[PDB]
From a paper:
The light-harvesting-reaction center (LH1-RC) core complex of this purple phototroph is characterized by the co-existence of monomeric and dimeric forms, the presence of the protein PufX, and approximately two carotenoids per LH1 αβ-polypeptides. The LH1 complex is composed of 14 pairs of helical αβ-polypeptides, 28 BChls a and 26 spheroidenes surrounding the RC with a large opening in the slightly elliptical C-shaped ring structure.
A previously unrecognized integral membrane protein with a U-shaped conformation (designated as protein-U) was discovered in the LH1-RC structure and located to one side of the LH1 opening. Rba. sphaeroides protein-U is located in the interior of the LH1-RC complex between the RC-L subunit and two LH1 α-polypeptides and exhibits a helix-turn-helix conformation with both N- and C-termini on the cytoplasmic side. In the loop region of protein-U, Trp32 and Phe33 form close contacts with Trp265 and Trp266 in the RC-L subunit where a putative UQ-10 molecule is present nearby. Sucrose density gradient analysis revealed that the ratio of dimeric to monomeric LH1-RC was cut by nearly two-thirds (0.44 to 0.15) in the mutant, indicating that protein-U likely plays structural and functional roles in the stabilization of the monomer and formation of the dimers of the LH1-RC complex. The extensive interactions between the PufX C-terminal end (Ala62–Ile67) and a segment of the RC L-subunit (Gly143–Trp156) explain the experimental observation that the C-terminus of PufX plays an important role in dimerization and assembly of the LH1-RC in Rba. sphaeroides. All methoxy groups of the Rba. sphaeroides carotenoids point toward the periplasmic side, and the carotenoids can be grouped into two sets based on their orientations and positions in the LH1.
Residue numbers in the entry:
A (entry chain I), G (entry chain D), H (entry chain F), M (entry chain K), N (entry chain O): 1 to 54
B (entry chain M): 1 to 306
C (entry chain H): 1 to 246
D (entry chain X): 17 to 69
E (entry chain G): 4 to 48
F (entry chain L): 1 to 281
I (entry chain A): 1 to 45
J (entry chain B): 5 to 48
Write the structure that this text describes.
């Protein structure tokens, strides 16, 4: 576990960060979209329900 | 005017090229046929020689029987009238047996029996030709890409006529042997399964039929563009890269942002064409067996409003 | 088994469509990395390796054996434009053109570029020369079309630059490759057929003007042309459409 | 006053091509418009292929 | 080479990073005020 | 970020418009005068499709559609929510395609190669302009053009085809379909034949174009050659699109009825129209 | 921001000014079109209704 | 945390800045379009209803 | 403000003016088509 | 200074002076045209 | 540092003119927005 | 083996910065999850 | 088991890790989406139906 | 089975294990889906029916 630093001797640091940054953003976009799909977690229309904006 | 290298302005002809005998049984290979000046305006002028061995005999004689069986049925359907045969040539059809028989072989020769006979001749002729396609490459010590690419087209052929009719339980599901007949089958196949346009694999299969047309127009235009630098001989460009391959790559690098090599473009070409019939086989095999309405299935999968 | 879904609406048709997305992604990775066997790794504007190499890693080397004892080509491998590129950058920043430091056609830059290939003739399957003059090839004649031998050669300036002496033919392909044109200087140059327009009474070369035929690179053997000479001749002529049509 | 005429001719050369290309397309549209009205259309009006939206 | 793929030296990267974060803090400060104005106008919570 | 052999090819020249105003590369892409035009038209059309989605009320990409103006508007303008956005996106798409074709011409001049590629792309453009501009102009309204949706432009194809019965019976359709099938068959053969030569059996010398001719003469008795196959591939696709646009410029402008009835001119030729027997007699 | 001028020691003005010109005109047409599509802020029809032109 | 500046010894600032500008603008458009999509937060329709301009 | 003239030391004047003629004409065509579409400002009627 | 396109410092000022004078004169015609339409049919 | 070749004194002169055009551009847009918010406020 | 070219101490330093940013990103997400859970729990 | 470490002399470590990383991600996304499609384990709607959100 | 170990002289270990790795996973996934398709062995629908989760 301490020797996890040696993944950087195996994988090129440049490709890892581009791959990781894309992975994190696409994942975060995906999870924000799943909540928007559910009416029970769509925070935009929860506020409409709460504040009577319809 | 400017020469666009679409027709050969000058033809040069010499001794007939008899080919190379790597491992070829030189007995089976015939003699060189005639030279066509008309074909020489576009490509090579030499016709032949052709290798007709053991799988050539089996494929050509079975293919002859398939072709001749359908022809005699058309003469019977014309009442043995040469004028009526000419008139209704595109309307004659040899049809599979009625759905009442299912997959049974007990159908009369006029009610789907000759279809089974003709179908067997086609089964032997097409599959033997794949073996011949494989063996012709082997004798020259070449790769088997032609054999395996052909196997993709055989896949759709076997799905249409053999595999799916077995899975549907009746030969009546198969394709009739006719010109306007198999067009009606195609039109009616979509209507029975609810707008085949919404089959995801029919949609993908079309993406690669347009992609093949897009890719061969691109590749064919690219090579004729760099043909002035000896670009048509792609095989020697792979061994020793020249200015034709560099200009061809740098055109698509500056245009699209990515390019290919002289050898790698033919991996795009072969893979784009095999997916036309590889994907089409699955979409056809899924129709009726798994989905009996592609518009309703589409509605449950996005693709269409509720 | 219509309507049978393992979960939600995921039936056998969903398994097929989702399995293809995975297969297509693997195929696109394979097809792209098989196209990184030439021209990589990426360089800077001066020659040094760039700090960005792209999402796709380089593939593993493959060896091509050459059909007449011509050696083994392994790609991807060490690469170098083995020639004196005569260019000076027009800007310190990247992405801007490079201006020639002199005559562009002679120096071999821009649309007049050539690649330092193997300086040997191209061979057919029998080991002979793929391209050779028609008077040396036996049994070759002009089967159709205007025989472009003895016609004057007119340049893009509508001035005669010579007349055709022979046709260099591709023996196994059986197609004309070059026109050998004798100049008023008495020497002979090769012009690729794709760059000529054979009319009824002349051969018109739109690329070069009249006073440039004497500058076409020559060949070290009267009956043998090599890949290096082909690339210099083809590159020089086609480079005149830009640097020699003013 | 050569520079004033120089800049104007540079711009008028730019605007001339934009006009030349633009009014070249209108003739092409006008061509199919004329050929449309000399054919038996408007007596065989096809149905709407797509919902009006 | 983790000792620099881009040719920047250590001190040049520090200088470049200081200017970059200054723009990042300015750009985020505008977004904080923009969200503060929208939340007072029409809260989403 | 250049290919190892790219330095000697980046030279100034071969620009139809400008010369140094827009003569540079952004990464690997060449930014011409028409690269600026292509980006603007490509970007505006995309965001309009994104904007048309919020007017439609959906975010599923497979449900987003931009519909042409209704048949009541004829050949004039339309409101943006109804069909005005389609007309802007069609203009934006038309500008982006022609700029892309014109930008390829500048690349051909800078590399000194032939203009086969931009010429072949114009065939695609002319087929597209036939469906959205030329054919609707003849028929009289913008509402005959297809909508800009992933699955709704298929509904336009299906609905237009069945207006004339089975569209398989359009004679120019049959010719075009034949060219499309031949082009894909030849592409499979061309890729496989070159790959088999470059990648022989195992531990074997790379084959030669003399093996390529020999393979197809052994197989089918003829070989079009290395130059012939590339001319054929270009011409099959251009022919496929030419007869594609031909079959739709004659549908609804010259031919108005079922396409099945067309083939009765052959079956009712005077010298065999009355012979009894067969399918039609 | 006392040293934002260093951006021009990174990006060539010729490519920046061209890119910024396309962005500003793309953004302008984008917004002017957004208001036209919405009936609330279509100034061409607000005038038409205001002066009873229909 | 105090040695993040070494990201510039791995990625080129010219490609990082170009990607970031494209990403931030596209993210800005995506969020602005999402709000206009929702009736509850469409600022054009809110003022239309508030000031009675329908 | 008084140094905007240095825009002509960066871009080519003989090429900017040609392109600026194209831009001003296409913008003019764009607005006239929009005006021509609206029933109130359709002047060709 | 920069000399990207090869114009002297006093060459750019003279070209800009001519270009700007045409720009204002072009805008004067445009404002006249806009004022004519606004009198005929105001859009506000 | 110095990817484009301009020195410090050139960058500041280049950035001095750029910001002047920027503040000019925003000033016109500020007035345009103020006028439109007078005519038809969106808040 | 070492396929990239980084020496052992470079791998130590590259990991040290990466993990320092890895905790920062996960620290902010923990606070965001703890804030959303109070407002509207999913369990 | 004592000699399982030889696996890395047969296969490239760089290709194994990318192969496994993609496999693990897609498998976890598949299982998570399988539970979301089952109303018995959809944790988003379970909370909604428990806290009377709707 | 004493001489089974010579199977490896005939086949590459690399080509066999990839073929075995793909085959085992595809067989396993297929059987799991076949069980989910049958209502009698869907372990998620059984639990819902057992615990009254619908
Ligand atoms: C299938 C039976 C195998 C046939 C091919 C055998 C073969 O290896 O020949 C190689 C063939 C010739 O090899 P060779 O001459 O022996 O080699 C000479 C030298 O060694 C030099 O040879 P080479 O180096 O030129 O050949 C290398 C080539 C050879 O490799 C292949 O042949 C790959 C074949 C893949 C077949 C896929 C079948 C369809 C699967 C669809 C999945 C569902 C959708 O490598 C590839 O093409 C790799 C292709 C892409 C692989 C990466 C895809 C990853 C997927 C996802 C992974 C990550 C997640 O080369 C080819 O490229 C052929 C391409 C065309 C293949 C067509 C296959 C059609 C199959 C029948 C129709 C479909 C059946 C039903 C499918 C759906 C069922 C429901
Ligand atoms: C109204 C009808 C339906 C429709 C119904 C169908 C049906 C049914 C099918 C298709 C299929 C296809 N459709 Mg569809 N299709 C429709 C609309 C379209 C549109 C369009 C613009 O609207 C297009 C472009 C397409 C295009 C396509 C292709 C992508 C695909 C055919 C691939 C192919 O090449 O098979 C042709 C190639 C073969 C069949 C292989 C043949 C190879 C054999 C082995 C060789 C035998 C040779 C023989 C013996 C002759 C020998 C002669 C001598 C040697 C000389 N369809 C509409 C919606 N379509 C096919 C498919 O698979 O898609 C899922 C299919 O089955
Ligand atoms: C004419 C023979 C075939 C052909 C040839 C061909 N295509 C070509 C070329 C050639 C020679 C190119 O050089 C050019 C290229 O660079 O390819 C990589 C291209 C090209 N052909 C392409 C696509 C394409 N070709 C097709 C067909 C064909 N292309 C023919 C069959 C199809 C089909 C059948 O559907 C498609 C989708 C591109 C990959 C490329 C041209 C890229 C381009 O135009 O770039 C500039 C424009 C954009 C970046 C996008 C603009 C987007 C719009 C502003 C908005 C959207 C409008 C659109 C109409 C919406 C559609 C909605 C629904 C219908 C889905
Ligand atoms: C049901 C029908 C399909 C099954 C049969 C068809 C499939 C394969 C047929 C045979 C093809 C074998 C090709 C192997 C090529 C040599 C191996 C290779 O080239 O890659 C190897 C690494 O593979 C790696 O880590 C990646 C693999 C690591 C081990 C995991 C095994 C793969 C399973 C992953 C999930 C698959 C879905 C070796 O790296 P270097 O060289
Ligand atoms: C549809 O089907 C369902 C889903 C219903 C059921 C199907 C289930 C199936 C088919 C399940 C299959 C499950 C499988 C096969 C799971 C396998 C899981 C495995 C093998 C997980 C392994 C994980 C390994 C990990 C996470 C290792 C990580 C290692 C590191 C993070 C350290 C990196 C290594 C370094 C740094 C080595 C460096 C050393 C040197 C000397 C350089
Ligand atoms: C669909 O789901 C939704 C969208 C609803 C929710 C999802 C949201 C997501 C996934 C959001 C993701 C957001 C992220 C990751 C945002 C990241 C924002 C960042 C990183 C912003 C940073 C901005 C920094 C800027 C603009 C800095 C600019 C700096 C300058 C202009 C300074 C100039 C620099 C110079 C001059 C370098 C110095 C040069 C020398 C020579 C020293
Ligand atoms: C769907 O969402 C909607 C569209 C509704 C809302 C979304 C809105 C969004 C995403 C808005 C984004 C807005 C942004 C990022 C706006 C940024 C605007 C900027 C940065 C404008 C800058 C303008 C700067 C200008 C016009 C500067 C001009 C400079 C000059 C004319 C100086 C000339 C330079 C010279 C003379 C060179 C000097 C050379 C020497 C040697 C001194
Ligand atoms: C679709 O969205 C709409 C259209 C509704 C809303 C969008 C509107 C937008 C985005 C509009 C954008 C407008 C812009 C950016 C306009 C910019 C216009 C500019 C900068 C015009 C500048 C013109 C300058 C000119 C014409 C200078 C000409 C100078 C000369 C020709 C020099 C010599 C001429 C002299 C001295 C005049 C006297 C000479 C003679 C020969 C009479
Ligand atoms: C004057 O003319 C003469 C008489 C000299 C010769 C003329 C011949 C003529 C006019 C021939 C016309 C031929 C035509 C129109 C052929 C058309 C063929 C078409 C359109 C075929 C299309 C599809 C066919 C398919 C997909 C066939 C698939 C068959 C299989 C996949 C295998 C079938 C095998 C089966 C069903 C089982 C057989 C097994 C047993 C044990 C019987
Ligand atoms: C991109 C390649 C990799 C893909 C992801 C890797 C996993 C591949 C298998 C994914 C299977 C799960 O995929 C998921 O299946 C469920 C099953 O109904 C679908 O179905 C769900 O949404 C649809 C559409 O709103 C509803 O009609 C349905 O009632 C609901 O159950 C999801 O829309 C789909 O996202
Ligand atoms: C669809 C097809 C669109 C039409 C394509 C162009 C048709 C020809 O259109 C015409 O072309 C010529 C070049 O020959 C252009 O060129 C003309 O104007 C330009 C600009 O003022 C000047 O260089 C000169 O007066 C003249 O060459 C014209 O501006 C254009 O009106
Ligand atoms: C490039 C392919 C796509 C091109 C798209 C082109 C669309 C732009 C069209 C510009 C020309 C518009 O042309 C104009 O349209 C308007 C639309 O109300 C028509 O206006 C007509 O309908 C309106 C409807 O209220 C009525 O006032 C009246 O019947 C008539 O004026 C005009 O008769 C026509 O002259
Ligand atoms: C529509 C605009 C098409 C391009 C117009 C500018 C091309 C003409 C420029 N130039 C210099 C040749 O005149
Ligand atoms: C200030 C008034 C300006 C008037 C000139 C505007 C540009 C004129 C372009 C003329 C083009 C004519 N044509 C037919 C080529 O399109
Ligand atoms: Fe090729």
């Amino acid at each position: 576990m301490s020797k996890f630093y040696k993944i950087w001797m195996i994988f090129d640091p440049r490709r890892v960060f581009v791959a990781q940054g894309v992975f994190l953003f696409l994942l975060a976009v995906m999870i924000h979209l799943i909540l928007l799909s559910t009416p029970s977690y769509n925070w935009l229309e929860i506020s409409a329900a709460k504040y009577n904006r319809v | 005017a400017e020469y666009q290298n679409i027709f050969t302005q000058v033809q040069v002809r010499g001794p007939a090229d008899l080919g190379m005998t790597e491992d070829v049984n030189l007995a089976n290979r015939s003699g060189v046929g005639p030279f066509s000046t008309l074909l020489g305006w576009f490509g090579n002028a030499q016709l032949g020689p052709i290798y007709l061995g053991s799988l050539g005999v089996l494929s050509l004689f079975s293919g002859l029987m398939w072709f001749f069986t359908i022809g005699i049925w058309f003469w019977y359907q014309a009442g043995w009238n040469p004028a009526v045969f000419l008139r209704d040539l595109f309307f004659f059809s040899l049809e599979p047996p009625a759905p009442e028989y299912g997959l049974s072989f007990a159908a009369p020769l006029k009610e789907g029996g000759l279809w089974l006979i003709a179908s067997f001749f086609m089964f032997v002729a097409v599959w033997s030709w794949w073996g011949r396609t494989y063996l012709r490459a082997q004798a020259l010590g070449m790769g088997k890409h032609t054999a395996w690419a052909f196997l993709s087209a055989i896949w759709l052929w076997m799905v249409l006529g053999f595999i799916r009719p077995i899975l549907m339980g009746s030969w009546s599901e198969a394709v009739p042997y006719g010109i306007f007949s198999h067009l009606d089958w195609t039109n009616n196949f979509s209507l029975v399964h609810g707008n085949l346009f919404y089959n995801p694999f029919h949609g993908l299969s079309i993406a690669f039929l347009y992609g093949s047309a897009l890719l061969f127009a691109m590749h064919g235009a690219t090579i004729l563009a760099v043909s002035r630098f000896g670009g048509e001989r792609e095989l020697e460009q792979i061994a020793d890269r020249g200015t034709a391959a560099e200009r061809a790559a740098l055109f698509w690098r500056w245009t699209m942002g990515f390019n290919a090599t002289m050898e790698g473009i033919h991996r795009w070409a072969i893979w784009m064409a095999v997916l036309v019939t590889l994907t089409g086989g699955i979409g056809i095999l899924l129709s009726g067996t798994v989905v009996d309405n592609w518009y309703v299935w589409g509605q449950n999968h996005g693709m269409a409003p509720l | 088994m219509v309507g049978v879904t393992a979960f939600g609406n995921f039936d056998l048709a969903s398994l097929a469509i989702y399995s293809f997305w995975i297969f297509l992604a693997g195929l696109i990775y394979y097809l792209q990395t098989e196209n990184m066997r030439e021209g990589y790794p990426l360089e800077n504007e001066d020659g040094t390796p760039a700090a960005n190499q792209g999402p796709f890693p380089l593939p593993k080397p493959k060896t091509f054996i050459l059909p007449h004892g011509r050696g083994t080509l392994t790609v991807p491998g060490p690469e170098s434009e083995d020639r004196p590129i005569a260019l000076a950058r027009t800007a310190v920043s990247e992405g801007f053109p490079h201006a020639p430091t002199g005559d562009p056609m002679k120096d071999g830059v821009g649309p007049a570029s050539w690649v330092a290939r193997r300086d040997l003739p191209e061979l057919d399957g029998h080991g002979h020369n793929k391209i050779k003059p028609m008077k040396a090839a036996a049994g070759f004649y002009v089967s159709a079309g205007k025989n472009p031998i003895g016609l004057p050669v007119r340049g893009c300036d509508l001035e005669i630059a010579g007349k055709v002496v022979d046709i260099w033919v591709d023996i196994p392909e059986q197609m004309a490759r070059f026109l050998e044109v004798e100049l008023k200087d008495g020497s002979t140059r090769l012009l690729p057929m794709q760059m000529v327009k054979v009319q009824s009474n002349r051969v018109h070369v739109n690329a070069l003007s009249s006073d440039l035929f004497a500058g076409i690179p020559t060949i070290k053997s009267p009956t043998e042309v090599t890949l290096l000479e082909e690339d210099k001749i083809c590159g020089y002529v086609a480079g005149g459409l830009m640097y020699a049509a003013p | 006053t050569n520079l004033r005429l120089w800049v104007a001719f540079q711009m008028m050369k730019g605007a001339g091509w934009a006009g030349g290309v633009f009014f070249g397309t209108l003739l092409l549209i006008g061509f199919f418009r004329v050929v449309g009205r000399m054919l038996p259309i408007d007596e065989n009006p096809a149905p709407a292929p797509n919902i009006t939206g | 080479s983790d000792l620099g793929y881009t040719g920047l030296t250590d001190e040049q990267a520090q200088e470049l990073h200081s200017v970059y974060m200054s723009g990042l803090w300015l750009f985020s400060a505008v977004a904080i005020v923009a969200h503060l104005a929208v939340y007072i106008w029409r809260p989403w919570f | 970020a250049l290919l190892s052999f790219e330095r000697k090819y980046r030279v100034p020249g071969g620009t139809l418009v400008g010369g140094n105003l827009f003569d540079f590369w952004v990464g690997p892409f060449y930014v011409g005068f028409f690269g600026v035009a292509t980006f603007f038209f490509a970007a505006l059309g995309i965001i309009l499709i994104a904007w048309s989605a919020v007017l439609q009320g959906t975010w599923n990409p497979q449900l987003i559609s931009v519909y042409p103006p209704a048949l009541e508007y004829g050949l004039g303008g339309a409101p943006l929510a109804k069909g005005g956005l389609w007309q802007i996106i069609t203009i934006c798409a038309t500008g982006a395609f022609v700029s892309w074709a014109l930008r390829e011409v500048e690349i051909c001049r800078k590399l000194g190669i032939g203009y086969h590629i931009p010429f072949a792309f114009a065939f695609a453009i002319l087929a597209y302009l036939t469906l959205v501009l030329f054919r609707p102009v003849m028929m009289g309204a913008w509402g005959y053009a297809f909508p800009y949706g992933i699955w709704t432009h298929l509904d336009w194809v299906s609905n237009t085809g069945y207006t004339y019965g089975n569209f398989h019976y359009n004679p120019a359709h049959m010719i075009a379909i034949t060219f499309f099938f031949t082009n894909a068959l030849a592409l499979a053969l061309h890729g496989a034949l070159v790959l088999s030569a470059a990648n022989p059996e195992k531990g074997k010398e790379m084959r030669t174009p003399d093996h390529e001719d020999t393979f197809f003469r052994d197989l089918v008795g003829y070989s079009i050659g290395t130059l012939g196959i590339h001319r054929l591939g270009l011409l099959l696709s251009l022919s496929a699109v030419f007869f594609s646009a031909l079959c739709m410029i004659i549908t609804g402008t010259i031919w108005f009825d079922q396409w099945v009835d067309w083939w009765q001119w052959w079956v009712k030729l005077p010298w065999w129209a009355n012979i009894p027997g067969g399918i039609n007699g």
